[PDB]
Design a protein around this nucleic acid. Structure first.
Lengths: 50, 225, 236
RNA sequence: AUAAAU
């Protein structure tokens, strides 16, 4: 009797799954850059000293 | 050229980070420890310092592995017959030659002898087989073959003393490694008739092993050359 | 015609002989040769083309074989099976829980450690742990294999047990029936289970079978039962 | 779904 709702629910369910997938690729890239910041923060001057 | 070619254990090679000036831009060389090297801490005059120090007596080899440029150099020390090869240890994905120690109904436990290298050459693990110091591994009944994973007769697959080439899925516990012979290039390699009492047998079919000497045929799990 | 190990075999090489206890087929040289000492028994069927053999020899250490009836003792319980030892200082045997009538993955059998069971060996490999099953298909619709209750178990050499199970001319079961009512389970692993209504009768049976096991005499055994059941009377 | 991984 509630099969119409279920069909609607599946359509309701479907839209959310799609939104998540596009976002994911961006997240991985940053990590080498995060490693970069530490070198930036350290003074060039010390390196010649040590 | 800045760092010595050959370093004895305890000899300083290169600091933590490095940089040079070329093409009007600073190129950052990132030094990372490797086989034969160990990043440790040394302090002079109340000053803390981290530098790559060799731990093995060998020639030293560097290799690059991965606006403003970016770089990564791998610093290692290579010794330079007798072979030791400790760095080599069974890890997920590696291929390992094993020997069947005992057969049970739901699984088959073995012992690790040698491990296949990467591009054949192998790394032999030297240990006493009459003690138990040798690494032990367990091949599950579901990991025997991809064909019919549920029902597998272990008696008709392996045999005590037979040499089996497998790939380790995971470390498991301290007792048993996880071994799979699911693919084609994995299975019983060297074996003899009647648990080693008869003559040598060779691999023909993937599920059949025959002996071109006494005409004996025993059911095993054979691999592909 | 006693046969000794390394003895020459009359049969021709081209024609095969079915394996029997005592007879060994060399995995290396493919030759068939006797390895036990005793009487050679050979059965021939048809005008030509088939043969079978074994050697009846005195041995007391049981080695599990397909379709052998054995009486085992369940020392301990594992996850999916019982650990039962047919014999002392002998490798353990694997008995499946699902190897019972009306078995289910939800309900395990009620057998406890220390119980006697009548069992038949289904799969027995030399290099693998042997397995037994409570119900044997070959015997009939009903195995008659169930854990034994009370009674007394008797140690006996494999030859004496095999004669008691397969030979109908063996007077032992007859001479015991002439003295008392009793039920008996016979294992090819050299175990004999005996149970009567009264302990004195079971004890009398135990003592007779033991002496019969010791005596190995057809004439003695009839008398032996006489003096045994008599001696219990006075002892009473 | 009447008692699950000694």
């Amino acid at each position: 009797q509630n099969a119409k709702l279920l069909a609607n629910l599946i359509r309701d369910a479907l839209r959310n799954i799609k939104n998540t997938n596009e976002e994911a690729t961006p997240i991985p890239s940053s990590e080498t850059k995060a490693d970069g910041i530490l070198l930036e923060t350290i003074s060039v001057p010390q390196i010649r000293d040590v | 050229f800045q760092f010595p070619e050959i370093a004895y254990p305890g000899k300083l090679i290169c600091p933590q980070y490095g940089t040079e000036n070329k093409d009007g831009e600073d190129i950052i060389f990132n030094y990372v420890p490797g086989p034969g090297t160990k990043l440790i801490q040394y302090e002079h005059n109340g000053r803390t310092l981290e530098a790559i120090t060799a731990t093995l007596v060998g020639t030293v080899r560097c290799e690059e592995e991965k606006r403003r440029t970016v770089k990564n150099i791998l610093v290692s020390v290579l010794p330079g017959a007798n072979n030791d090869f400790a760095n080599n240890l069974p890890k997920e994905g590696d291929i390992v030659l094993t020997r069947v120690t005992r057969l049970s109904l739901q699984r088959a436990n073995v012992e690790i002898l040698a491990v296949e290298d990467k591009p054949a050459t192998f790394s032999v693990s030297q240990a006493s087989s009459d003690l138990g110091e040798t690494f032990r591994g367990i091949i599950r009944s579901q990991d025997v073959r991809s064909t019919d994973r549920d029902r597998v007769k272990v008696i008709e697959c392996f045999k005590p003393g037979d040499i089996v080439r497998a790939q380790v899925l995971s470390l498991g516990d301290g007792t048993n490694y996880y071994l799979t012979t699911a693919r084609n290039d994995l299975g019983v390699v060297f074996a003899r008739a009647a648990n080693g009492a008869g003559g040598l047998m060779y691999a023909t079919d993937w599920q059949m092993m025959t002996s071109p000497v006494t005409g004996a045929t025993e059911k095993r799990k054979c691999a592909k050359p | 015609t006693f046969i000794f190990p390394g003895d020459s075999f009359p049969v021709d090489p081209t024609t095969p002989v079915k394996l029997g206890p005592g007879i060994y087929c060399d995995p290396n040289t493919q030759e068939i040769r006797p390895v036990n000492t005793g009487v050679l028994h050979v059965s021939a069927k048809g005008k030509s083309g088939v043969q079978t053999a074994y050697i009846d020899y005195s041995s007391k250490r049981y080695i599990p074989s397909v379709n052998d009836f054995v009486i085992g003792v369940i020392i301990g319980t594992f996850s999916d099976s019982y650990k039962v030892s047919l014999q002392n200082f002998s490798s353990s045997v694997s008995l499946s829980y699902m190897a019972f009538p009306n078995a289910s993955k939800k309900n395990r059998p009620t057998l406890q450690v220390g119980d006697l069971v009548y069992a038949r060996v289904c799969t027995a490999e030399k290099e693998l742990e042997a397995e037994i099953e409570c119900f044997d298909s070959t015997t009939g619709r009903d195995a008659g294999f169930g854990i034994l209750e009370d009674g007394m178990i008797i140690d006996v050499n494999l030859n004496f047990a095999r004669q008691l199970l397969f030979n109908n001319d063996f007077p032992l079961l007859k001479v015991l029936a002439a003295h008392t009512k009793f039920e008996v389970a016979i294992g090819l692993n050299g175990k004999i289970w005996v149970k009567c209504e009264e302990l004195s009768n079971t004890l009398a049976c135990y003592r007779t079978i033991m002496e019969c096991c010791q005596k190995n005499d057809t004439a003695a055994f009839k008398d032996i039962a006489k003096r045994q059941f008599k001696e219990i009377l006075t002892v009473k």
